[PDB]
């Protein structure tokens, strides 16, 4: 057929056109290392996930202890448990840096790659959410309870959708068993949609930090990026393991080392760090319905980014005003994250509403406005 079997074969050909002979911009930076880390992150969660699943029991009466049994009796069960739980954070850190990069470099102009990306994010959140319930600790149960009740606030079909989801009248055993099923399932959907993500991406190829056409200077993925990415893997993997081995519970809620108890509300029902920012926005709008929408919108807002691009240039590399607005936004998110971990009291309440309000202003109003303004300052 053809000279080398790396091009002719119906399968290698695929491996070649996406990991070896695939044309990559010669100037992509470290911010482009997060896609591969996300992929590796996913393979690792699925792997450690299956290993934990083989010892788990989805029943309110055995969940908590099945997880303890795993940590206490299974050979390296504790290690796997740690890696899986901490891997979830590594996953989100990587995803927020992946998203950031795209916002700062206008990657979102690759609409389908961007939209499939938002879907990956939503699926990843649902996965982590239902996974969090499995150990059936106090925050497991109360987080499930708080969040799922929000939806009984949807008009007319509210209580229905919720009671349907619960499989009863409250978060109970029939909820746990279906959440386990979902938690096992979604990651595979993530792997699938990821293939689509990269398929759309390959239609255009990668964007680069200067935002101008790199056809004049492309290099093969291998060895340049296979090496750059492997290096990027160990650089991140170090802080990861240092955390999972030297400070296993640094990010976890102590409340989860207590079996779920429907008759004892924890004093501070708050999520994992990666959900805090959204929890803050949730509580910013006093009114069950508005808060839920505000919550939903905090992430769905990402589907609008491609439509709010006004700049004549793709990236923010050469856009100083947009750059500061970008870091304001990032700082804005740290503040929301912080507010999300605090009780609902003064001064946190007002600060919360300010950061929630500026969050949407910056993405919906300022970014497109400053973009236009900058077009005028370039005499365009």
């Amino acid at each position: 057929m053809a000279p080398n079997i790396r091009k002719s074969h119906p399968l290698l050909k695929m491996i070649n056109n996406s990991l070896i002979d695939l044309p990559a911009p010669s100037n992509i930076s470290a911010w482009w290392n997060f896609g591969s880390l996300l992929a590796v992150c996913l393979m690792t969660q699925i792997l450690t996930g299956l290993l934990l699943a083989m010892h788990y029991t989805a029943d309110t009466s055995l969940a908590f202890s099945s997880v303890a049994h795993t940590c206490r009796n299974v050979q390296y069960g504790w290690l796997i448990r740690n890696l899986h739980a901490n891997g979830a954070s590594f996953f989100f850190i990587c995803i927020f840096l992946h998203i950031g990069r795209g916002l700062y470099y206008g990657s979102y102009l690759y609409k389908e790659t961007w939209n499939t990306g938002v879907i990956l994010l939503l699926t990843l959140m649902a996965t982590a959410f239902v996974g969090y319930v499995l150990p059936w600790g106090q925050m497991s149960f109360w987080g499930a309870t708080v969040i799922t009740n929000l939806f009984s606030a949807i008009p007319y079909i509210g209580h229905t959708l919720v009671e349907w989801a619960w499989g009863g009248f409250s978060v109970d055993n029939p909820t746990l068993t279906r959440f386990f099923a979902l938690h096992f399932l979604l990651p595979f959907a993530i792997a699938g949609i990821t293939i689509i993500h990269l398929t759309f991406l390959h239609e255009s190829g990668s964007n680069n930090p200067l935002g101008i056409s790199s056809d004049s200077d492309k290099i093969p993925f291998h060895p340049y990026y296979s090496f750059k990415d492997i290096l990027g893997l160990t650089l991140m993997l170090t802080p990861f393991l240092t955390l999972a081995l030297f400070s296993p519970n640094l990010l976890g809620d102590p409340e989860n080392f207590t079996p779920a108890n429907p008759l004892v509300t924890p004093p501070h029902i708050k999520p994992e760090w990666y959900f805090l920012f959204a929890y803050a926005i949730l509580r910013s709008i006093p009114n069950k319905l508005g808060g839920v929408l505000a919550l939903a919108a905090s992430v769905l807002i990402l589907f609008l980014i491609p439509f709010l691009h006004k700049s004549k240039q793709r990236t923010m590399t050469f856009r100083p005003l947009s750059q500061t607005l970008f870091w304001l936004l990032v700082a804005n998110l740290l503040i929301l994250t912080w507010i999300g971990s605090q009780p609902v009291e003064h001064p946190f309440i007002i600060i919360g509403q300010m950061a929630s309000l500026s969050y949407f202003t910056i993405l919906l109003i300022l970014f497109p406005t400053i973009g236009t303004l900058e077009n005028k300052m370039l005499n365009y």
Binding site: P25, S26, N27, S216
Partner: protein
């Protein structure tokens, strides 16, 4: 007075693409109009643009910029594409308008 001019020249230096030796027009996102515009450029202008860009990407992968001497000066920045791009957009708007009537 010379306010708009003080601002522009300021943004121009604040932007910083001139440190890569790129002209303002070199930094345009290549949407549909820009692509057509580029096809109309005379060979020499086109090859120069290409080198400037290739050069920029190489500087970018190296994490360097040009020596202060080689930086494009605000007043010496040649708007080589703006003329074509305006005509392309003019033509497009005509058709859009006409196909409506």
């Amino acid at each position: 007075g010379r306010l708009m001019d003080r601002i522009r020249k300021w943004y121009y230096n604040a932007a910083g693409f001139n440190k890569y030796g790129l002209m303002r027009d070199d930094t345009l996102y290549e949407d549909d109009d820009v692509k057509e515009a580029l096809k109309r450029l005379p060979e020499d202008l086109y090859n120069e643009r290409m080198f400037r860009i290739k050069r920029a990407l190489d500087l970018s992968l190296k994490h360097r910029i040009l020596p202060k001497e080689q930086w494009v000066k605000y007043e010496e920045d040649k708007p080589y594409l703006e003329p074509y791009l305006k005509e392309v957009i003019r033509e497009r708007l005509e058709r859009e308008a006409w196909n409506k009537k």
